[PDB]
Amino acid sequence: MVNPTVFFDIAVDGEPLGRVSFELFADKVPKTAENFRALSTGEKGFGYKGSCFHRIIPGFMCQGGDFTRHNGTGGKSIYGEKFEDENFILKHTGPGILSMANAGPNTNGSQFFICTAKTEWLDGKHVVFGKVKEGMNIVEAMERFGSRNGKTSKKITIADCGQLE
Amino acid sequence: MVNPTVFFDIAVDGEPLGRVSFELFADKVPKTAENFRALSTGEKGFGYKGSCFHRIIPGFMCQGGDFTRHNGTGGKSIYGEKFEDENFILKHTGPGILSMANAGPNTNGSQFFICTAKTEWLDGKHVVFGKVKEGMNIVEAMERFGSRNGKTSKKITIADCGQLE
Amino acid sequence: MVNPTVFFDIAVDGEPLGRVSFELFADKVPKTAENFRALSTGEKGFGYKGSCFHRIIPGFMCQGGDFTRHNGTGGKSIYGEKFEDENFILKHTGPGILSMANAGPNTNGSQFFICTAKTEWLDGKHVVFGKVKEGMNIVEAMERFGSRNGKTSKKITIADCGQLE
């Protein structure tokens, strides 16, 4: 099968920032990739449109995906309240890596993070499932609104999102 | 040595509701019981005075102790960020049992729950460290401000706390 | 993020011997680097300034970091009493390797050692987290105050410390 590409249109406080597209590695982690694709299209009745990036730490990552509580305590997968850690084939090799946030082994829901650096200490604890295809400059722009403890100064929102291929 | 006894004066919004006193089983879980006792006196410079019970589910338990984020994502022990599950000798045997809340094994901080029912499905996963000595009637009164999801209707506060014996 | 550089200004009783700088591998062991870094600036209220290297064995290592008991039975981390062994990605590859001393698995506090030789027999038991950037000759000078039992001949002291980069 061919790997899907999803996009996010980011908006800082209302103003459009730009678009990030991501390649989802369905050829390595199909169930994890499908969860993200489906929450991006919004085809199951919920997903990421309108959710915000609740925690951004410059030179580390931008964490988002909590469309239910918007603060890191929620989110859900299309498979249920949580799903298994599919496998750990891909590693946190550089900036632009998309990986699952979790609350310990096998608690995957909807929260994810985009690495702005290589985060190899996280290898084997978080499932890597995608990479930024276009728009790294928008992620780099997003970084600038975060602080050492993660609070953003402006509301970074996924204004729209969906699938491209 | 002797088992300490601490008290909590509960206030619904601002009105005094009453006192609950607890025996802490320092003779079974000395490190877990010293943590709670010190956070109740505030002797290490921080603790439960002023915090709230953020999650109350009637017929189950009252949860509190998050004096940093006040919503369930914080708290800390006198030993650091988190500490080890001391042992699982004692069981959740009925109403009045005071036990540690956590985020999986060995993440004890300061959050606790007072059981308003026997919760044996929690045995072996949460460390039991005390029991209500007096004021079980006040705990039953607190229950009434909860709901099935745990959100309260009034802010239940530990207006005061300290050691007795 | 970027790897911190910290410095120590070593004093042998009176006269300054010199400055050793260290690169801390925050790209491999972020939680262990931040501990040394924060304890070197002293930003959290306590730290390394004024402590001594209490055990130096020539041709093996210089050990210091016990700022509370000064003899090897103390120290504490910014995270508390002790903290986990983060990972053992890095090995003890040669002189000027900076690694955590411990009292067995997951008992890291503040004590560390500066290797003056390749200690590979310690791989897997001690978390390596930094390397002497500039200043190896000052460490080689410190060496000559030890003995096979670790006794220092003169009072080696970290006169000042902080973060460069």
Binding site: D66, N102 | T73, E81 | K31
Partner: peptide, 11 residues
């Protein structure tokens, strides 16, 4: 420290 968890965030 530098971790990414959902709910109890540690150092």
């Amino acid at each position: 420290x530098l971790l990414v968890x959902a709910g109890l965030v540690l150092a």
